[PDB]
Design an enzyme around this catalytic site. Structure first.
Site, PDB file in Angstrom:
ATOM      1  N   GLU A 138       0.799  -1.222   0.000  1.00  0.00           N
ATOM      2  CA  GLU A 138       0.000   0.000   0.000  1.00  0.00           C
ATOM      3  C   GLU A 138       0.838   1.282   0.000  1.00  0.00           C
ATOM      4  OE1 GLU A 138      -3.655  -2.096   2.443  1.00  0.00           O
ATOM      5  OE2 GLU A 138      -3.153  -0.011   2.920  1.00  0.00           O
ATOM      6  N   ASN A 176      -6.567   5.693   9.075  1.00  0.00           N
ATOM      7  CA  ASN A 176      -7.331   4.659   9.758  1.00  0.00           C
ATOM      8  C   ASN A 176      -6.796   4.402  11.159  1.00  0.00           C
ATOM      9  OD1 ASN A 176      -9.462   3.963   8.060  1.00  0.00           O
ATOM     10  ND2 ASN A 176      -8.242   2.485   6.899  1.00  0.00           N
ATOM     11  N   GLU A 185     -14.452  28.038  -2.304  1.00  0.00           N
ATOM     12  CA  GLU A 185     -14.161  28.720  -1.050  1.00  0.00           C
ATOM     13  C   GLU A 185     -13.308  27.857  -0.123  1.00  0.00           C
ATOM     14  OE1 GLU A 185     -17.623  30.639   0.542  1.00  0.00           O
ATOM     15  OE2 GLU A 185     -16.643  31.088   2.453  1.00  0.00           O
TER      16      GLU A 185
HETATM   17  N1  LIG Z   1     -11.815   3.539   6.779  1.00  0.00           N
HETATM   18  C1  LIG Z   1     -12.009   2.557   5.906  1.00  0.00           C
HETATM   19  N2  LIG Z   1     -10.942   2.045   5.195  1.00  0.00           N
HETATM   20  C2  LIG Z   1     -11.134   1.043   4.303  1.00  0.00           C
HETATM   21  C3  LIG Z   1     -12.406   0.527   4.097  1.00  0.00           C
HETATM   22  N3  LIG Z   1     -12.311  -0.447   3.167  1.00  0.00           N
HETATM   23  C4  LIG Z   1     -11.020  -0.558   2.782  1.00  0.00           C
HETATM   24  N4  LIG Z   1     -10.275   0.353   3.483  1.00  0.00           N
HETATM   25  C5  LIG Z   1      -8.821   0.576   3.361  1.00  0.00           C
HETATM   26  O1  LIG Z   1      -8.451   0.572   1.996  1.00  0.00           O
HETATM   27  C6  LIG Z   1      -7.183  -0.026   1.812  1.00  0.00           C
HETATM   28  C7  LIG Z   1      -7.225  -0.955   0.603  1.00  0.00           C
HETATM   29  O2  LIG Z   1      -8.011  -0.377  -0.416  1.00  0.00           O
HETATM   30  P1  LIG Z   1      -9.439  -0.997  -0.824  1.00  0.00           P
HETATM   31  O3  LIG Z   1     -10.503   0.071  -0.885  1.00  0.00           O
HETATM   32  O4  LIG Z   1      -9.814  -2.079   0.158  1.00  0.00           O
HETATM   33  O5  LIG Z   1      -9.211  -1.689  -2.261  1.00  0.00           O
HETATM   34  P2  LIG Z   1      -9.897  -1.097  -3.590  1.00  0.00           P
HETATM   35  O6  LIG Z   1      -9.970   0.409  -3.545  1.00  0.00           O
HETATM   36  O7  LIG Z   1     -11.268  -1.705  -3.775  1.00  0.00           O
HETATM   37  O8  LIG Z   1      -8.907  -1.563  -4.770  1.00  0.00           O
HETATM   38  P3  LIG Z   1      -8.647  -3.122  -5.089  1.00  0.00           P
HETATM   39  O9  LIG Z   1      -7.246  -3.507  -4.677  1.00  0.00           O
HETATM   40  O10 LIG Z   1      -8.808  -3.307  -6.576  1.00  0.00           O
HETATM   41  O11 LIG Z   1      -9.650  -3.993  -4.371  1.00  0.00           O
HETATM   42  C8  LIG Z   1      -6.843  -0.767   3.095  1.00  0.00           C
HETATM   43  O12 LIG Z   1      -5.666  -0.248   3.670  1.00  0.00           O
HETATM   44  C9  LIG Z   1      -8.022  -0.543   4.018  1.00  0.00           C
HETATM   45  O13 LIG Z   1      -7.589  -0.210   5.315  1.00  0.00           O
HETATM   46  C10 LIG Z   1     -13.483   1.039   4.808  1.00  0.00           C
HETATM   47  O14 LIG Z   1     -14.613   0.590   4.633  1.00  0.00           O
HETATM   48  N5  LIG Z   1     -13.279   2.057   5.714  1.00  0.00           N
END
Ligand SMILES: Nc1nc2c(ncn2[C@@H]2O[C@H](COP(=O)(O)OP(=O)(O)OP(=O)(O)O)[C@@H](O)[C@H]2O)c(=O)[nH]1
Ligand SMILES: CCC[C@H](Nc1nc(-c2ccc(NC(=O)NCC)c(OC)c2)ncc1C)c1cccnc1
Ligand SMILES: Nc1ncnc2c1ncn2[C@@H]1O[C@H](COP(=O)(O)OP(=O)(O)CP(=O)(O)O)[C@@H](O)[C@H]1O
Ligand SMILES: Nc1nc2c(ncn2[C@@H]2O[C@H](COP(=O)(O)OP(=O)(O)O)[C@@H](O)[C@H]2O)c(=O)[nH]1
Ligand SMILES: [Ca+2]
Ligand SMILES: [Mg+2]
Ligand SMILES: [Mg+2]
Lengths: 54, 437, 426, 334
Positions: B183, B206, B254
């Site tokens: 990530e 997070n 703004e």
């Molecule tokens: N706060 C919060 N963070 C999230 C949530 N879902 C995923 N994340 C964060 O998003 C990161 C990974 O991105 P994802 O959104 O899960 O993956 P994506 O955007 O669908 O992209 P893909 O790899 O193709 O699945 C992780 O580090 C998670 O902590 C959520 O519902 N709430």
């Protein structure tokens, strides 16, 4: 200290308090970057099938 | 009135988007079936809430939102969700296979075969607008879709909608809840490509939200449901001015003017209070002074850092509930003499205050208790650079060994983009340094 | 969806055992009909099962061999009836523990028939994600033809995930002396044409059965109980819904920092023997301590002799996810030296509410350690001992192979060894 | 089993601490860039505070207070005392000082230089020590970096026999709870050569650094008089004690300085914690009035006191955070 720009309404009010004063790429280029990456993928895939052919 | 379109990308963007629109409906008094009994202008109108909603002849109020994911898992729960009737099929876009936590796979490979579809579905909403000001983009830094596809989308929107503003609500990666390891790569990559296209971006670590859920809500192991409910409250506080009557931050332009003097440095730190548990029986309601003072505690920020060892460029206070200017100035005066609040010399040391008399709404069955007064502070401080420093360090550790790089190269991306992106981040950290010290 | 393949004697016997275990977990009977109580058992059953007319689920499995012996034992086995009859593809000549026969002559004569079944299964998938193979590397069919299939599956499906559950040969559990030859020739193929290879060492399975399970003389059945339990373990997240939105490709991406280094060390806890019900459930600290212990590794390699690149842990059963989080963070912080620092937070964990049959809770371990080189070095020494005298080589030259191809295999595996050593000192 | 890292090899103090920690058999040393640590004995420059307190399942602690440099830099200390209402421009225990930049408050300095000259009183200053302002300003511009101009105490307390100058070094430890601990054992870094009132050129009797001095070792071993001897001297010569005549002022100055910057460096509600060892340098005049010279963020201890102090740091600053399976400090209460 100094409150200014006080605006009020039924929903609420907003203002500003000052404590102290002071002292892009085009569509052509994008489609070119994405396609340049597609060719690099097609080359790698060709080398594989060439390697597998051997 | 000027309309605003919300864009939710990836798992994080979609699920957070649902929490927000769920909260918006409860605040405006809109029911799951889209009906709004209080709206006496049936079939249309141009009130403040029409910034986020359009109206049908049947009196249904639909979100000006587009959900997009390269995988149908998450968006399907929206199609069958309790607010299923609220949206319509054309707003919900889903692919076959996801980006597999790979920026290059979401940007180049899968991003290319769906980008035209998304922009078309977005254009459909844009045609329903008499005066579009811009977009609100929700996504994660870690996800391949949230990182990869978003950067591509942000590029095209800047071409298809040049005069329009574009704000971001980004989820900064945290190992405590994340299940991927690459990530840091995706984060540096999407930030680099998106930077020039984003006018103002609100980062939400997070890690910070996770601990706030443990510390202040007494939840041992916070789930994404717990995090998103709390996140949606912060987002609501920020977008309330666009959805309600007022004179502070009434349009997207703004936000740039008030919070972003320097373009590249467009990452305001958000701080929210109070966060009270709903299962907490006895709660002494906090005053204006107490919650305003809590906005300077690192434990209440969306990103953990130390504003004391930085410099401010702007600061906005957004109250909701029983609050009046007198109590605010009294609270500010006290806090100013007790805390380290250094502004840059070329900026006035002040606070732009916004108040809405309606107290913050909470979802029934949620973890948050109803409070008499709450506040969200948006402060553009150089101290948020600590988040960039943490992230770029993790990036350097992995890239020094070229770990996982072959996954990105295999999707058509050049290895040069890793360093070119890292160089842009190095420049960004320098910009913060010059302003900060 | 995932397309399963099982080649050879070993492959079909662990493969059948694998389908036997998960069929019970999904509530599927030998008849094929579902008989459970939880909808959770069917929410992700499409991954491994095709839904047929009626209320019967059929495994997306393809049974391959050059001998009808083992496959006739499968079809007459417990869940022998569940398998699609057309997916039984077998020759008559056999391979005689000869990699050459399986990869070039006897197997090449049959491989096309197998691919027809693979394609017919793939065309029934809504969105095929990848393949998985169960086989040994010590014999001829599973080793020779198995890698031939992998090579051809990649040619037709070059963008799909290819996983393998490869059983490694060992003198402790040996059928023939030419096993090091077959394995070395096979590893060469696995390094190139697989995203994941779960190294299952018969040396480890034996020692576990002997030293730990206290089985005086373990059979292949005792060994397979460990394999089936592990395989059910690793595939847990794919077969049941949970917090981890599981995805084949994502695991391959997050576990493999370098393409060639995709040979994992499987692990399982608690270790149990056949039918011997142990009534004490392990505490979370006990699960965590055992699964990391070398005694629980299915690959005879000391992890303390190397460093972990990445680690995947999956706990099963009703337990405090907080307690799991604490114990996992404890192991890392206590022994942070055995984890590479150039991959931050390389230990991820998940929890499935559904436990396996017989245990109230368990833990499955998947480690990408540099210590795996000890396995490849072991095979290399056994290989060299014979090859320096060109012993038993006529079995292969008779099938058209040349001594050069052996030298190449020896060299490529030694490169894999040194490549694993490169990152052990980084 | 706690873990720590060392990122400052030149630290004589924390070289002993690391030695002490490992000797307990409950502390393990990790590599430099191993982020999974409990304790960080960080570097003196560019200490990455922004990367601390972000490791889940690890209470992290560092041996430096972020922002404490404002106290431990000569240019910063003057600005700190002058601007802070808690200390004020009318500070009784800090010498009259001004900030000067090479070609700011140069015009402000000359304003005071006139009163000293047009009053016919002591007009000696220090950066080199000179009575002429022109000789000083020319020296600062020739060096390159920023310098501080400060009033020179022309009437220091002089030890006998010898008629010698000296300065007092006090070691202060501020833990994570911001308890200000004063190490009971200080040291007088004395001059061996008699104090010359007329000639300021001879800086061998004006500057009392342990390096310059090294008549070395004539009166006491290594030009270092400990408190038991100096206390005895005050009782015999001046009919008073170290406690009353000097140490009350020391404890007042130490406490006042740290109370001032507390809200700016406190780690009370931070995600990571901080402690730090400070070295306060004082200067006593003939009327037994204590003056603050500077503060050191990375001080070195005295050879006799390493064993006791370094052990002390483990007890109250480290072991207090990370417990294991009468006191040498004086707690300056506030
Ligand atoms: N706060 C919060 N963070 C999230 C949530 N879902 C995923 N994340 C964060 O998003 C990161 C990974 O991105 P994802 O959104 O899960 O993956 P994506 O955007 O669908 O992209 P893909 O790899 O193709 O699945 C992780 O580090 C998670 O902590 C959520 O519902 N709430
Ligand atoms: C470093 C390991 C990271 C890994 N992450 C993922 N892992 C998986 C995943 C997919 C399939 C499986 N199961 C398999 O059998 N895969 C191979 C057929 C899996 O077990 C480990 C994990 N899916 C998505 C992600 C993000 C992970 C996370 C949590 C627990 N185990 C693995
Ligand atoms: N205002 C003043 N009046 C008289 N003497 C002074 C003075 N300021 C400093 N001195 C003497 O000159 C010396 C200057 O040393 P100073 O403390 O400024 O340098 P330094 O930073 O090397 C101390 P350390 O090495 O312990 O950090 C002091 O030891 C003191 O002996
Ligand atoms: N665990 C296990 N290993 C086996 C079994 N049968 C064979 N093997 C291993 O596989 C090797 C022999 O290969 P074989 O199965 O005969 O390959 P085939 O020719 O394709 O059938 C030996 O090294 C054995 O250790 C079995 O039933 N269980
Ligand atoms: Ca209306
Ligand atoms: Mg996703
Ligand atoms: Mg056999």
């Amino acid at each position: 200290m100094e409150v200014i720009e006080l605006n009020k309404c039924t929903s609420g009010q907003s203002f500003e308090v000052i404590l102290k004063p002071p002292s892009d790429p085009s569509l052509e280029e994008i489609q070119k970057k994405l396609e340049a990456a597609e060719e690099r993928r097609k080359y790698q895939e060709a080398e594989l099938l060439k390697h597998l052919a051997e | 009135m000027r309309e605003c379109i919300s864009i939710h990308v990836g798992q994080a963007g979609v699920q957070i988007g649902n929490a927000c629109w769920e909260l918006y409906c409860l605040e405006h008094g809109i029911q799951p079936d889209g009906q709004m009994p209080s709206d006496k202008t049936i079939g249309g109108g141009d009130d403040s809430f029409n910034t986020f909603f359009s109206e049908t002849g049947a009196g249904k109020h639909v979100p000006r939102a587009v959900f997009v994911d390269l995988e149908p898992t998450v968006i399907d729960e929206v199609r069958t969700g309790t607010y299923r009737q609220l949206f319509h099929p054309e707003q919900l876009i889903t692919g076959k296979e996801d980006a597999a936590n790979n920026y290059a796979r979401g940007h180049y490979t899968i991003g290319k075969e769906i980008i035209d579809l998304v922009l078309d579905r977005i254009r459909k909403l844009a045609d329903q607008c008499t005066g579009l000001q811009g977009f609100l983009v929700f996504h994660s830094f870690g996800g391949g879709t949230g990182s990869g596809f978003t950067s591509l989308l942000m590029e095209r929107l800047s071409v298809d909608y040049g005069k329009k503003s574009k704000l971001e609500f980004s989820i900064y990666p945290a190992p405590q809840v994340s299940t991927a390891v690459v990530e840091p790569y995706n984060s540096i990559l999407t930030t680099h490509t998106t930077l020039e296209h984003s006018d103002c971006a609100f980062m939400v670590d997070n890690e910070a939200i996770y601990d706030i859920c443990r510390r202040n809500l007494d939840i041992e192991r916070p789930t994404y449901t717990n995090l998103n409910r709390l996140i949606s409250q912060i987002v609501s506080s920020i977008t309330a001015s666009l959805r309600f009557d007022g004179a502070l931050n009434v349009d997207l332009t703004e936000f740039q003017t008030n919070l972003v003097p320097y373009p590249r440095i467009h990452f305001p730190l958000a701080t929210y209070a109070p966060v009270i548990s709903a299962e907490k029986a006895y709660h002494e309601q906090l005053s204006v002074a107490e919650i305003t003072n809590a906005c300077f505690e690192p434990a209440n920020q969306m990103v953990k850092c130390d504003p004391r060892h930085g410099k401010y460029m702007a600061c906005c206070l957004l109250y909701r509930g029983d609050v009046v200017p007198k109590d605010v100035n009294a609270a500010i005066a006290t806090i100013k003499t007790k805390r380290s609040i250094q502004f840059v010399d070329w900026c006035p040391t002040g606070f732009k205050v916004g108040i809405n008399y309606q107290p913050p709404t909470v979802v029934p069955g949620g973890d948050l208790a109803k409070v008499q007064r709450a506040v969200c502070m948006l402060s553009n401080t150089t101290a948020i650079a600590e988040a960039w420093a943490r992230l770029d360090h993790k990036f350097d550790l992995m890239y020094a060994k070229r770990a996982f790089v072959h996954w990105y190269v295999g999707e058509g991306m050049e290895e040069g983009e890793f360093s070119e992106a890292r160089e842009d981040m190095a420049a960004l950290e320098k910009d913060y340094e010059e302003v900060g010290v | 969806e995932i397309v399963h393949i099982q080649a050879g004697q070993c492959g079909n016997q662990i493969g059948a055992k694998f389908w036997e275990v998960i069929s019970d977990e999904h509530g599927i009977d030998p008849t094929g009909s579902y008989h459970g109580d939880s909808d959770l058992q069917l929410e992700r059953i499409n991954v491994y099962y095709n839904e047929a007319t009626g209320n019967k689920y059929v495994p997306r499995a393809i049974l391959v061999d050059l001998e009808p012996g083992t496959m006739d034992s499968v079809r007459s086995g417990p869940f022998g009836q569940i398998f699609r009859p057309d997916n039984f593809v077998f020759g008559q000549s056999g391979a005689g523990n000869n990699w050459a026969k399986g990869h070039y002559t006897e197997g090449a004569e049959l491989v096309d028939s197998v691919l027809d079944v693979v394609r017919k299964e793939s065309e029934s998938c809504d969105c095929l994600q990848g393949f998985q193979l169960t086989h040994s590397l010590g014999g001829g069919t599973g080793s020779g033809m198995g890698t031939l299939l992998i090579s051809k599956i990649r040619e037709e499906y070059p963008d799909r995930i290819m996983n393998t559950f490869s059983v490694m040969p060992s003198p402790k559990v040996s059928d023939t002396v030419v096993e090091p030859y077959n394995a070395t020739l096979s590893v060469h193929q696995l390094v190139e044409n697989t995203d994941e290879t779960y190294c299952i060492d018969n040396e480890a399975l034996y020692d576990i059965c002997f030293r730990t399970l206290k089985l005086t003389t373990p059979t292949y059945g005792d060994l397979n109980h460990l394999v089936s339990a592990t395989m059910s373990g690793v595939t847990t997240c794919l077969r049941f819904p949970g917090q981890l939105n599981a995805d084949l490709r994502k695991l391959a991406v997050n576990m493999v920092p370098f393409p060639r280094l995709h040979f994992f060390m499987p692990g399982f806890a608690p270790l149990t023997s056949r039918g011997s019900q142990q009534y004490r459930a392990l505490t979370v600290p006990e699960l965590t301590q055992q699964m990391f212990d070398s005694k629980n590794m299915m690959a005879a390699c000391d992890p303390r002799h190397g460093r972990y690149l990445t680690v995947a842990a999956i706990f099963r059963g009703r337990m405090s996810m907080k307690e799991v989080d604490e114990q996992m963070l404890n192991v890392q912080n206590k022994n942070s030296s055995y984890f590479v620092e150039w991959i931050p937070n390389n230990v991820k964990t998940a929890v499935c509410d559904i436990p396996p049959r017989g245990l109230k809770m368990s833990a499955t371990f998947i480690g990408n350690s540099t210590a795996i080189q000890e396995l490849f070095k072991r095979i290399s020494e056994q290989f060299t001992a014979m090859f320096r005298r060109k012993a038993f080589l006529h079995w292969y030259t008779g099938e058209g192979m040349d001594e050069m191809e052996f030298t190449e295999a020896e060299s490529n595996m030694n490169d894999l060894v040194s490549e694993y050593q490169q990152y052990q000192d980084a | 089993m706690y873990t720590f890292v060392v990122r400052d090899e030149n630290s004589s103090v924390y070289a002993e601490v690391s030695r002490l920690l490992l000797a307990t058999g409950q502390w393990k040393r990790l590599r430099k860039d191993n982020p999974r640590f409990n304790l960080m004995l960080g570097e003196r420059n560019r200490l990455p505070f922004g990367r601390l307190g972000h490791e889940p399942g690890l209470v992290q602690l560092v041996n430096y207070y972020r922002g404490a440099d404002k106290l431990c830099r000569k240019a910063s200390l003057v600005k700190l005392i002058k601007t802070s209402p808690e200390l004020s421009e009318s500070c009784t225990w800090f010498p009259e000082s001004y900030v000067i930049y090479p070609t700011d408050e140069r015009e402000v300095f000359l304003a005071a230089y006139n009163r000293r000259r047009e009053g016919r009183e002591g007009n000696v200053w220090i950066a080199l020590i000179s009575s002429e302002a022109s000789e000083l300003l020319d020296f600062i511009d020739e060096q390159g970096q920023v310098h501080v101009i400060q009033k020179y105490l022309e009437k220091p307390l002089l030890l006998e026999p010898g008629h010698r100058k000296f300065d007092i070094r006090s070691w202060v430890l501020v833990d994570h709870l911001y308890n200000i601990y004063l190490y009971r054992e200080g040291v007088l870094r004395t001059s061996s050569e008699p104090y010359n009132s007329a000639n300021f050129q001879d800086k061998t009797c004006h500057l009392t650094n342990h390096c310059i001095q090294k008549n070395y070792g004539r009166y006491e071993e290594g030009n270092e008089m400990f408190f038991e001897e100096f206390n005895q001297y005050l009782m015999d010569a001046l009919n008073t004690t170290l406690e009353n005549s000097i140490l009350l002022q020391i404890k007042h100055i130490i406490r006042s300085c740290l109370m001032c910057i507390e809200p700016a460096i406190s780690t009370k509600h931070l995600h990571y914690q901080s402690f730090q060892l400070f070295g306060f340098d004082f200067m006593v005049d003939e009327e037994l009035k204590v003056w603050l010279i500077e503060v050191n963020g990375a001080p070195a201890c005295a050879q006799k006191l390493y064993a006791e102090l370094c052990q002390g740091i483990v007890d109250v600053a480290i072991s207090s955070v990370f417990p294991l399976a009468t006191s040498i400090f004086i707690k300056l209460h506030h």
